[PDB]
C-alpha cells in the first residue's frame with residue numbers, strides 16, 4: 009500500500025517501513041492540521057507579524073504566549089517601567105495580548121527603546137522577561153556579566169535598510185567560506201557587521217568562494233559559545249551591530265555574487281534564565297512550555313534547554329524564525345546546527361555509529377524533532393526554491409538529505425564531519441612515511457552517493473575542541489619567523505606550505521559535492537582560536553584574524569591564498585564538485601602517490617618527502633592531449649616551477665572500452681607525467697577539434 013521513493017535509492021531502508029510509515033503519518037497529520045487551522049505552512053510561519061511587538065492600523069499590538077502567568081503587563085522606558093496602565097489579557101490558548109494606540113500620531117513605544125514582559129506566576133513578586141520574539145537585545149559591554157535589555161526595533165523609514173541587490177542564482181556546487189563576524193577583524197576586539205561586509209566579503213569573493221556560512225547571528229549571551237547557545241532567537245547578535253547592519257552585510261554579499269547562509273540553532277536554547285527563552289519555564293507542564301521538563305528537558309547537556317517540538321506554539325516559533333531570517337535579511341538558506349542532538353533522544357553522545365541501520369531507526373529516533381525539520385524543509389524550499397539547507401550531523405543518518413516528498417528529512421547537504429580527524433591524527437601521530445594512501449582515500453570517499461555532502465579539511469569544529477590549525481600542526485612556532493619571502497624558506501616551512509595545499513585540494517576534489525573553508529585557513533593562518541576567558545586574562549589576541557599576514561608581500565602566506573584562489577577558480581571552470589564521475593585508479597603505497605578522476609580532470613598527488621617520479625603512467629578516460637590544469641609547484645603558489653604548464657601529454661590505448669582485464673588500472677587510456685615530491689597536479693584534455 010505504501011512505497012517511498014527513498015526505498016529505490018537504498019534497499020536496506022524498507023526493513024524499517026514501520027518506522028517511516030509512522031514518521032510520515034506524523035508529518036502529514038501535523039501539516040494537515042496546520043493547513044486546516046493556520047492557513048498552511050507559509051501562513052503559519054508569518055508568526056513574527058503577530059507575536060512580539062507589531063504596528064497595525066494606527067495602533068501597536070504586543071502578543072506573548074505565556075499560559076503559566078496569571079497576570080501580565082508590558083513594561084518599558086515608554087511607561088517608566090510601570091505597567092499598571094498596560095495590563096495584558098489572556099486568551100483561551102494562554103496567549104497574552106494588548107493594543108496600544110498611537111500617542112501624538114506616533115507609535116507609543118519609541119523605536120530603539122527598552123521593554124520587558126512582566127508577569128506573576130502565583131500572587132508573588134513580578135517576574136520580568138525579554139519578549140521571546142524580540143528582534144534586538146543590548147548589553148553594557150563595559151560591565152562583566154551584564155544582563156541584556158530587550159529593545160523594540162522598528163526604525164523610521166530613513167533608517168531602514170533598503171535591499172539594492174538580488175539573490176544570486178543557486179551555484180552548481182557550494183564553495184563555502186565559513187565565518188564569524190566578531191572575530192573577523194585584525195584588531196583585538198569584537199568586530200562589526202559593517203567592517204566584515206566592507207573588508208572581508210571582498211576577500212571571500214576575490215578567492216572565488218560562492219557562499220558565506222555566517223555563524224553566530226542569533227543572539228547569544230556567551231560570546232565563547234561561538235553562537236551555539238541562543239538566548240533571543242529573533243535577535244541579531246548586538247555585539248557586532250544592529251539588524252540593519254546585518255541587512256547591509258547580506259546585500260553587499262549579493263552584490264559581489266555571494267550567497268549567504270545563516271547558522272540556525274534549533275537544537276536547543278541556552279539555559280540562561282535571566283536573558284533567554286529558558287526564563288519562560290516557571291515549572292508548568294511541557295504542553296504550556298517551550299521545553300520538556302525533568303530529564304527530558306536537558307539530558308545533562310551543558311547550557312541547554314531542549315524543545316518540545318510537538319508543541320503547536322513551538323512549531324509556530326521555530327518555523328516563523330526561519331521565515332523571519334529569510335524574508336527580513338534575504339538569506340539564501342541555512343545550516344541547522346546540532347542535528348545529531350535533534351535526531352536522537354541520546355543525542356548521539358557516546359555513540360558509536362558502526363553502520364547498523366538499527367542505530368538510526370529505533371525508539372531512540374526523535375520523531376517530534378524530525379517532523380519539525382521536515383516541516384521546516386518543506387517550508388523553506390517553498391519560500392525559496394533555490395535555497396540551500398545544510399545539516400550539521402556527525403551520525404550520517406540515511407535520507408537526511410533527500411527531499412521531504414521522497415520521504416527524506418529535506419536537507420540539501422550534510423557536512424563531511426569525519427574528514428578533519430583523519431588529517432589531525434595523521435599530523436599528530438603518523439610520520440610522513442607511515443601515511444596510508446588507501447586510508448586517506450577511504451576517509452574522503454566513504455560517504456553516501458545518493459546524498460550530497462560538503463567537505464572540508466578543517467573548520468570551526470576543531471577550534472571549539474581547542475585543536476590547532478592544519479598549518480600550525482605542520483609548521484608550529486617556526487611560522488612567526490620563517491615566513492619571509494625575502495630569504496629562502498627552511499625545509500620544514502617548504503614542507504608545510506606544500507602539504508597545506510595538497511590537503512585542502514584532495515579534500516576538495518575527492519571529499520564531496522561541496523567545499524567549506526573557515527576564515528583565515530585559506531592562507532594557512534597560524535596560531536589558533538581562543539576566546540577571552542579568565543585563563544587567558546580576557547585576551548582577544550587569539551580572537552581575531554591577522555589579515556596583515558596575507559596582505560604583506562614579503563611573506564609567504566600569499567602563496568597559500570593564491571593557491572586557494574586558483575583552486576576555487578579551477579572548480580568554477582571545470583565544475584568537478586557537481587560531477588558524479590569519481591574514479592580512484594591508483595593508490596601507490598610504496599611511492600606515496602594517489603591518482604584519481606573527478607569530472608573531466610585527472611589528479612596526481614605525490615605525498616612522498618623527496619622522490620621525483622618521471623614518466624609516471626596515469627589512467628584516464630578519453631584519449632587525446634593533456635595539459636596542466638592546476639599545479640601546486642607553480643612559482644605563484646610558492647613552488648619550485650619544476651612542472652611545465654605548456655607541455656603536451658599524449659594518450660596511449662590500453663586494451664578496449666569496458667574490459668577490466670586489458671585496461672590500465674581499470675582505465676581505457678593512459679598518459680605520462682612528471683611528479684616532484686609533495687606536489688598535486690590536475691590535468692585537463694585539450695579540446696580538439698575546437699580551434700582549429
Ligand SMILES: OC[C@H]1O[C@H](O[C@H]2[C@H](O)[C@@H](O)[C@@H](O[C@H]3[C@H](O)[C@@H](O)[C@@H](O[C@H]4[C@H](O)[C@@H](O)[C@@H](O[C@H]5[C@H](O)[C@@H](O)[C@@H](O)O[C@@H]5CO)O[C@@H]4CO)O[C@@H]3CO)O[C@@H]2CO)[C@H](O)[C@@H](O)[C@@H]1O
Nearest residue numbers: 044045046073075076099100101102103295296297320321
Ligand atoms: O475549532 C474551534 C476553534 O477555532 C479557533 O481556534 C484555532 C486557533 O485559531 C488556531 O491557532 C489553532 O489553535 C492552536 C493554538 O493557536 C495553539 O496555541 C495551541 O493551543 C494550545 C496552547 O498553546 C496551550 O497553551 C494550551 O492552552 C490551554 C489549554 O487548552 C487548556 O486546557 C488549559 O489547560 O489552559 C491552557 C493554557 O491557557 O493548549 C492549547 C490547545 O492544545 O494549539 C492549538 C491547536 O490545538 O487551532 C484552533 C482550532 O482550529 C478559534 O480561535 C477558537 O475560538 C475556536 O474555539
Ligand SMILES: OC[C@H]1O[C@@H](O)[C@H](O)[C@@H](O)[C@@H]1O
Nearest residue numbers: 026027030370371372373375
Ligand atoms: O513514538 C513511538 C513510535 O516511535 C517510532 O520511532 C517507532 O518507529 C514506532 O514504531 C513507534 O510507534
Ligand SMILES: OC[C@H]1O[C@@H](O)[C@H](O)[C@@H](O)[C@@H]1O
Nearest residue numbers: 083088089122124135136157
Ligand atoms: O526588572 C526590570 C528593571 O529594568 C531595569 O532596566 C530598570 O533599572 C528597573 O526599573 C526595572 O526594575
